[PDB]
Amino acid sequence: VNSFSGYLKLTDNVYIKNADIVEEAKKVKPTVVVNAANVYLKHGGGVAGALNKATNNAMQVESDDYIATNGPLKVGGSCVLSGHNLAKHCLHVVGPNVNKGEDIQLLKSAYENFNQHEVLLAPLLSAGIFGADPIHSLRVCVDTVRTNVYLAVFDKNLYDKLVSSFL
Ligand SMILES: O[C@H]1CC[C@@](O)(CNc2ncnc3[nH]ccc23)CC1
Ligand SMILES: [Cl-]
């Protein structure tokens, strides 16, 4: 039993809700919140910009030190950093950005990072400003993640389409 509330159950391990991931994280304080990161951990917009804003830019400050030490992530890769005031940890995961021409096949690799954590609050990877089809992202999530994932979908119209089209 966990404290996630109001989710629709899609499969044994995948759950979905129309919610602002920032507000969900503040309420639940999950062990892991997933960020829709880029390889430079520049949290300018989308989910990343919103999460970082909610940390009063502390996420960005920590991220800049991480990059200065380690260099950029790989597309499809991840790193674990602090969750600041939102969660114990933030798993920064880089899905492919279609608006940069990146290979959508890397979306499966990106979701594999979730399997290193027993329970996560997450957005749909490569959705929104990353330009992928969110219906496809949900399919890859369900077919790749085996740990317990609670998906927050900001857009109510999109949430309803994801549910009604889910096979
Ligand atoms: O087009 C849709 C695709 C999924 C998404 O859910 C991605 N972006 C977010 N997902 C959850 N919480 C959030 N807060 C700010 C941004 C944000 C919405 C756009
Ligand atoms: Cl977005």
From Swiss-Prot:
Activity regulation, free text: Inhibited in vitro by GRL-0617.
Subcellular locations according to the entry: Host endoplasmic reticulum membrane
Sequence ranges assigned to domain Macro in this UniProt record: 1-167
Catalytic activity: Thiol-dependent hydrolysis of ester, thioester, amide, peptide and isopeptide bonds formed by the C-terminal Gly of ubiquitin (a 76-residue protein attached to proteins as an intracellular targeting signal)
Membrane topology field: Multi-pass membrane protein
Function as written in the Swiss-Prot or TrEMBL entry: Responsible for the cleavages located at the N-terminus of the replicase polyprotein. Participates together with nsp4 in the assembly of virally-induced cytoplasmic double-membrane vesicles necessary for viral replication. Antagonizes innate immune induction of type I interferon by blocking the phosphorylation, dimerization and subsequent nuclear translocation of host IRF3. Also prevents host NF-kappa-B signaling. In addition, PL-PRO possesses a deubiquitinating/deISGylating activity and processes both 'Lys-48'- and 'Lys-63'-linked polyubiquitin chains from cellular substrates.
Protein name (Swiss-Prot/TrEMBL): Papain-like protease nsp3
Organism of this sequence: Severe acute respiratory syndrome coronavirus 2
